[PDB]
Design a protein around this ligand. Structure first.
Ligand SMILES: *[C@H](C)[C@H]1/C(=C/c2[nH]c(/C=C3N=C(/C=C4\NC(=O)C(CC)=C4C)C(C)=C\3CCC(=O)O)c(CCC(=O)O)c2C)NC(=O)[C@@H]1C
Ligand SMILES: CCC1=C(C)/C(=C/C2=NC(=C\c3[nH]c(/C=C4\NC(=O)[C@H](C)[C@H]4CC)c(C)c3CCC(=O)O)/C(CCC(=O)O)=C2C)NC1=O
Ligand SMILES: CCC1=C(C)/C(=C/C2=NC(=C\c3[nH]c(/C=C4\NC(=O)[C@H](C)[C@H]4CC)c(C)c3CCC(=O)O)/C(CCC(=O)O)=C2C)NC1=O
Ligand SMILES: CCC1=C(C)/C(=C/C2=NC(=C\c3[nH]c(/C=C4\NC(=O)[C@H](C)[C@H]4CC)c(C)c3CCC(=O)O)/C(CCC(=O)O)=C2C)NC1=O
Ligand SMILES: CCC1=C(C)/C(=C/C2=NC(=C\c3[nH]c(/C=C4\NC(=O)[C@H](C)[C@H]4CC)c(C)c3CCC(=O)O)/C(CCC(=O)O)=C2C)NC1=O
Ligand SMILES: CCC1=C(C)/C(=C/C2=NC(=C\c3[nH]c(/C=C4\NC(=O)[C@H](C)[C@H]4CC)c(C)c3CCC(=O)O)/C(CCC(=O)O)=C2C)NC1=O
Ligand SMILES: CCC1=C(C)/C(=C/C2=NC(=C\c3[nH]c(/C=C4\NC(=O)[C@H](C)[C@H]4CC)c(C)c3CCC(=O)O)/C(CCC(=O)O)=C2C)NC1=O
Ligand SMILES: CCC1=C(C)/C(=C/C2=NC(=C\c3[nH]c(/C=C4\NC(=O)[C@H](C)[C@H]4CC)c(C)c3CCC(=O)O)/C(CCC(=O)O)=C2C)NC1=O
Ligand SMILES: CCC1=C(C)/C(=C/C2=NC(=C\c3[nH]c(/C=C4\NC(=O)[C@H](C)[C@H]4CC)c(C)c3CCC(=O)O)/C(CCC(=O)O)=C2C)NC1=O
Ligand SMILES: CCC1=C(C)/C(=C/C2=NC(=C\c3[nH]c(/C=C4\NC(=O)[C@H](C)[C@H]4CC)c(C)c3CCC(=O)O)/C(CCC(=O)O)=C2C)NC1=O
Lengths: 161, 36, 48, 65, 160, 161, 161, 160, 161, 160, 160, 160
């Protein structure tokens, strides 16, 4: 947990100095975009069963994966796969609300890269489902905030790949 | 001039030449073998 | 069999494949690839 | 150390009467030491690089290639 | 088929089919029934053309029947009949298409790497199928054994 | 790349049987109609430029596809309109001589759903171009083989769409 | 591959009209600022190795990726990186004379986004380096041309992130 | 353009720009206000150039306006000028760029397949775009009729 | 392609520690049983064209799979699957000397899953062929090294099924 | 020899010789006394090897003595025992040279097309080298049979 | 390693690894209990090898210690021991590997770039490395430095 | 001819001839006794053709012989009738080859670049050939209409 407020607190505290001008230009940029991020976090939570549906109905249904043989054939694999895609979207909105990907470094990308190769999960399909979930979310919230999730959606894809 | 490189003596290793005559039967008949 | 990687969603390969025509059309590219780079037919113990 | 590209390139100046479907969808495997002289060849042709994949081993392994 | 060889002969140069080439197709249609009469004479007289000509191969090459060689009397000479029966089946596939490629793609393309791994002389198959088609030309006629003669000799020159 | 001659070779091979009497009359079924395909393939090859002008004139030449901003606006693209329409005519008469649509799936309908998407070519326009090409070649051939020609054009249009 | 003169041509062609008065006001605006773009092209290409040997010195030389555990100890990986940051200086100076960001798109930005995810290297250290390259190059060429080179550095920076 | 040609030639040798080539771009940018007023000499008088070369084309070749010809009727004639209206737009792009590179990618690389498919004669277009040349250089100045006319004469020889 | 010697080299430089004491008994475990491997790998090359004599003749030769209609019935499909078994033996013997299955997933297991589902190759016939060739090597190298060769044989069958 | 693989596989990268490959040079000139004693003993009983391993080969594969085969009569079996003496001589070159390459160039790279043009079976001579290595490793010592028996093992393993 | 270089060479010939090279892996594994004493001796003197070879280098090239070279100052002579320690942290990765495959990919492949990119001449870097591998040869035995000193002196010709 | 490119298609794969195209050679040589009968009819009435194909051309495009045109003059038509007389020589070469490569190697390849240089319009010489096609097919019967008009088609579609 490091907010973009608290990130420049900690980078100023390791030097032990006060807030300079270029540190405040990170705050006053972040204080400017406050109302934009709050409008996005409402309309995702009102659509969080539909963003997780139109991502998988675009990219993963009727594919190799929903067919018998690989990784989403049984229902318990399907319930576990929609449990991940719900949890990626719920953890992406915190970095949209913070403005820092330190949530994704601490709470998501710790054990996830190791446990997918250890389970036989295709990384190359679930790096595509979050990639398919971006342009649903960039259309659902408006492209001004659609260019805000793209840092933190693909911070998962930079880590998970 | 007539030698250079020849081990002429086959001598002992030969010979058998018992020989045999072989008959004809249908290929289709499972002679070929079908596992399972 | 066609381009197996990069899935190419519709292919009517007829994967049973008793007689394809495609095996001669890919055998003589391979023989012509040996016939240009080596310039001749290679010996049978050497072709990678 | 082979990659796995997939590349969409168009025909720039010529109108090819043969099919050349394969000449617009190179989805080949290129090794690492000669990808970057090869990547600029698609890039100067006006092609589009769609995806690249590590078909070989792990990144960050500094020995054993 | 001779239809199938004609399209890829025209598709390599990206061309519609030549009307001289459609004359070969139009002659193939009106002579299509004659080749079916060629093929039934082989399949009807199969049991006299295989056991005889294999025995001609064993009289020409008595190396085959003897132990230490590839075949042996109880079933290995019997399974060299069914490995010879496959090629007569492939000729009848080839003559009703008017084309070489039913002989090619089923029984030519990897026979050298096959029979080296199987341990038979591939040349003895070629002398055996030469003994097969020597009596096949004397079977049906003298007229029809010439243009079906053009598909007999190819498999001789494919083994060696 | 299977012919209807080679298709009954393909079925008789995997049975393990010779040239069956059921396979004889099926070959004679192709041999009977083979006279009506050679006489119709000469008309297509003598009218390839005399068809593809009249397929674009019914559905293409005056719309928002040849305006500036249209997909086939410049003559770099308009020459790749006619030639990419010429493959659908040149391979239509190829399967007419074979009586088997297996040639279309191996040579033509192979990546064309994916290729036209990543160039920007609209698939909804060229599906009408094929159907306009079907109605002009029906009068040039006749209702005997124009029934037989017409089953390949929607077969192209099935996997293209 | 285009430049700012032909992009004005292409933006007028795909819209449809001739050289209207809005485009000539755009095109004469290129010819005024085109004099300073040449005089800042030479002083970058003079000190092209001198920039990149100092831009690595601001951010990368004593950090996580010099103590063992990151991208650059393996001598090929550091030497690729100096060579990658060399090619950002070449293509931005190709982008400076051409007057558009689209030369950076068809030469740098399309391929490079998915390799750096796949090869596991950080994009966040790269965009920290190019921003460190921005603050040294404005000191060399002067501030007024630094606003010109600050455009195409940011198009790499926003494009990679 | 000269900016585009000097980058792509210098990118392939992995080099920066030569000081001989940087002064080529420097004179090309500063003379850009000269070339834009040659472009507005034609677009200011575009509707006269079309109409005079409209009368000058059908005089020297009347079969295209004749019944049976490919521009017959008040809508079928309207198009052939509108096609000539495209080539005023193309050559005005060429004077601005200082090269025939927008003539290439927009206008001339597929005409030998298009009008053969469209049935109009290419040599009928090749004189109508040549009658465009005689009406343009009478309206221009002395020196730029070699400058702008090189983009005209490029469109003649690449047409025919 | 890297062995167990380079792997403990790979896991020692990257954390900032020297060649410590715990890396030596990983190497001394290699140096103890490495004398066994040179006695193993020579005798496989004595029977490298004789294991494939027994490969067809135990589980494939006089079966119904070779009978016309099955997958292994063509001469182009016969000889393509002796080399496809011979490569699985030769790359096993590289791993027999590597002490590591990290030559298999670079050169053997890279595209081997999808090329068998697409080409109609039954997976169960290969693992009934490969695991049948584990025990004939157990009679040729002795008891212990065939159990070492059974690791990489099962690593094929874990990476094929 | 040992240098001939190393002087080519480092010339192709145009570098000097890596000291791992200088182990390979060092690795033997200490074995060159041990590599020379074994080929002196192999040549010194080269008459007993061919007369014994040629003898019980025909108890294992009696087909090539039999009529219909190639080596019918003593005038061809003594011609057949030339290739046994040639391959015994090519063993003794390869032990002294140190590695795989001189027996590969002189007696290997045409034997699928030499022996096919002679009509002889390519598998039966591969049976004889396994008996030629049977009588040789039966007469030499125990410590060199892991060295000198393995140079036999290459010309087996690339013959069949 | 020497295991790794042999198997990639045998993949290029598409055959099994040769009995000439199988001596070397067998010679590597009986010397695998010979290589480990070189590795542990460099643990006990890595604070002694580097701290002497710096002053051996600075008496050979004192241009570095002068104000203006790339290591001037106490913060700047840290790396001119640390990059030397990093090369001592490369030989023990490849003493027990036998050869240069961890030497290249961590040390050699772009070393003409980055010392030019940092401004340090590699001829001074190779001099202290040569000054290092005189002290390490004197510390080890006469048999150890006979082969490891040949392995030491690869890097000087590889760097410059 | 058919035979001279069935060689080259079989030579570049280094194969012998397949029996599918040996049908194509054998059907060609029994068609040789009737194709030269077409060519003897064509050269027997060349002056009936060339005089009539001139007058069917010059009525259609009267601008080229009216002054201001390229073929103006008493003798300039006599070369331009001779320049159309050459294509009657080549079509009789193309009839007896059964092919179009003697049309191609002699009268196609640089025919755009000659008449661009000499100044005659390239379609105006192509309209003489279809005027020559209408009279030469009227010389013959029905079964020689398509066999002669196919090579007339190829010279039209190449020049236009
Ligand atoms: C979905 C389209 C892809 C996919 C999903 C899948 N995942 C699992 C199993 C697990 N997933 C997780 C995920 C997380 N742990 C975290 O802490 C976070 C951050 C919030 C995430 C996203 C974990 C821990 C497991 C294992 C434990 C469990 O019981 O779920 C499965 C089940 C695998 C199985 O064999 O049952 C599936 C199917 N897999 C795919 O095929 C798609 C590519
Ligand atoms: C062996 C266990 C198993 C189950 C349970 C299973 C369910 C399953 N049903 C699916 C779709 C579906 N299933 C249905 C079925 C129904 N809806 C209705 O209205 C019908 C009354 C009802 C039938 C009970 C429908 C309509 C879809 C498609 C949904 C869509 O495309 O939006 C899909 C997505 C496509 C795919 O990848 O397969 C899965 C995974 N698959 C399995 O392999
Ligand atoms: C043999 C099977 C097969 C086909 C048919 C095929 C077509 C194909 N069409 C293409 C382009 C094109 N295709 C069109 C198509 C059209 N214009 C329209 O407006 C209509 C919607 C449509 C035709 C009726 C256009 C405009 C282009 C140029 C745009 C591009 O570069 O993709 C290209 C890109 C290369 C080029 O021509 O420059 C290919 C390869 N490839 C194949 O492998
Ligand atoms: C149509 C394409 C095609 C061919 C050609 C084919 C051949 C073929 N020949 C075989 C065996 C055989 N073939 C022979 C043949 C011979 N040995 C001799 O002495 C003679 C010289 C020679 C033939 C005249 C023998 C002895 C076997 C059994 C080998 C064994 O069981 O070890 C076998 C293994 C057993 C079987 O399933 O019948 C196949 C698969 N399969 C195919 O799908
Ligand atoms: C294990 C593989 C490895 C290599 C090859 C390597 C090279 C290397 N040497 C460096 C610096 C350096 N290397 C030196 C060393 C030298 N310069 C001198 O003048 C001395 C004469 C000479 C030693 C012989 C110094 C002084 C620096 C810092 C340069 C500076 O701060 O300007 C740096 C940048 C700082 C860092 O992150 O370490 C790298 C990457 N580092 C590695 O980890
Ligand atoms: C002209 C358009 C273009 C770009 C931009 C490009 C990048 C690119 N960067 C690469 C490697 C690399 N690049 C880096 C980069 C860095 N190391 C760091 O610590 C920093 C974050 C960063 C630079 C200072 C590293 C560590 C590698 C090696 C990773 C690998 O081996 O894949 C490679 C693989 C080999 C090569 O260098 O040619 C390419 C192709 N290629 C292109 O064609
Ligand atoms: C900027 C590049 C460009 C070119 C070159 C171009 C040509 C072009 N000319 C067309 C038609 C035409 N073009 C002409 C023009 C002519 N025919 C004549 O007889 C005159 C001699 C001649 C003019 C010199 C006419 C009459 C038609 C309509 C023909 C028809 O509909 O059958 C069409 C089809 C309808 C349309 O205009 O959308 C195209 C695409 N379009 C372009 O975008
Ligand atoms: C070096 C690592 C490596 C492996 C292992 C490999 C296998 C491999 N097997 C293939 C085909 C094949 N593989 C088989 C396999 C078998 N047939 C049977 O009877 C059994 C089920 C199985 C016994 C092994 C068959 C039949 C084909 C050809 C498909 C066809 O007949 O069209 C192909 C497609 C190309 C071809 O051979 O035509 C590859 C690439 N490739 C590699 O690069
Ligand atoms: C330097 C490499 C090399 C070798 C080894 C070699 C052998 C060789 N074998 C020959 C003949 C032959 N060699 C054999 C040998 C055999 N056939 C069998 O069935 C057995 C498997 C085997 C002996 C046991 C036979 C039978 C002939 C005579 C072939 C014939 O008469 O058609 C001949 C021609 C006869 C002569 O010159 O005296 C040579 C030169 N030639 C070479 O260039
Ligand atoms: C067999 C291959 C072949 C070709 C193609 C060929 C063409 C040919 N046509 C020529 C002249 C000519 N050709 C024409 C032809 C025409 N004027 C028209 O208006 C009509 C369109 C057209 C013919 C119907 C004219 C007028 C000249 C004289 C050009 C001049 O003197 O300026 C000349 C120059 C005179 C000479 O060298 O004899 C050549 C070489 N000669 C050959 O041997």
């Amino acid at each position: 947990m490091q907010d973009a407020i608290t990130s420049v607190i900690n980078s100023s505290d390791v030097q032990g100095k006060y807030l300079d001008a270029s540190a405040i230009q990170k705050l006053k940029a972040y204080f400017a975009t406050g109302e934009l991020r709050v409008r996005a976090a409402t309309t995702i939570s009102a659509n969080a069963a539909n963003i997780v549906k139109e991502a998988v109905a675009k990219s993963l249904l009727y594919s190799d994966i929903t067919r018998p043989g690989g990784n989403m054939y049984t229902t318990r694999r399907y319930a576990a796969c929609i449990r991940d895609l719900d949890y990626y979207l719920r953890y992406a909105t915190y970095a949209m609300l913070a403005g820092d990907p330190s949530i994704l470094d601490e709470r998501v990308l710790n054990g996830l890269k190791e446990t997918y190769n250890s389970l036989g999960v295709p990384i190359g399909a679930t790096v595509q489902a979050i990639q398919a979930m971006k342009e649903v979310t960039a259309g659902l919230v408006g492209a001004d905030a659609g260019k805000e999730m793209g840092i933190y959606f693909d911070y998962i894809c930079s880590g998970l790949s | 001039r007539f030698v250079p490189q020849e081990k002429q003596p086959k001598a002992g290793d030969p010979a058998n030449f018992l020989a045999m005559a072989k008959q004809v039967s249908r290929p289709a008949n499972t002679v070929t073998r079908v596992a399972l | 069999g066609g381009y197996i990687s990069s899935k190419f969603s519709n292919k009517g390969g007829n994967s049973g494949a008793s007689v394809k025509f495609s095996e001669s059309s890919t055998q003589k590219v391979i023989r012509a690839a040996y016939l240009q780079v080596f310039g001749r037919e290679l010996y049978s113990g050497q072709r990678q | 150390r082979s990659f796995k590209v997939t590349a969409c390139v168009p025909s720039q100046t010529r109108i090819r009467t043969q099919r050349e479907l394969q000449n617009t969808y190179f989805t080949k495997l290129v090794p690492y030491d000669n990808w970057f002289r090869e990547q600029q060849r698609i890039m100067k042709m006006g092609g589009k690089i769609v995806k690249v994949e590590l078909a070989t081993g792990k990144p960050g392994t500094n020995t054993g290639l | 088929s001779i239809v199938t060889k004609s399209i890829v002969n025209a598709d390599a140069e990206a061309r519609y089919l030549s009307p001289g080439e459609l004359d070969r197709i139009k002659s193939f249609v009106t002579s299509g029934e004659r080749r079916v009469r060629i093929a039934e004479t082989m399949t009807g007289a199969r049991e006299r053309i295989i056991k005889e000509a294999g025995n001609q191969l064993f009289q020409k090459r008595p190396d085959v029947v003897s132990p230490g060689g590839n075949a042996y009397g109880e079933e290995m000479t019997a399974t060299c009949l069914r490995d010879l029966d496959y090629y007569l089946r492939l000729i009848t596939y080839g003559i009703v298409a008017g084309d070489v490629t039913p002989i090619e793609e089923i029984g030519v393309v990897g026979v050298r790497e096959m029979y080296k791994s199987l341990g038979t002389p591939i040349e003895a198959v070629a002398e055996g199928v030469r003994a097969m088609k020597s009596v096949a030309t004397s079977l049906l006629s003298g007229e029809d054994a010439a243009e079906a003669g053009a598909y007999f000799d190819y498999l001789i020159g494919a083994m060696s």
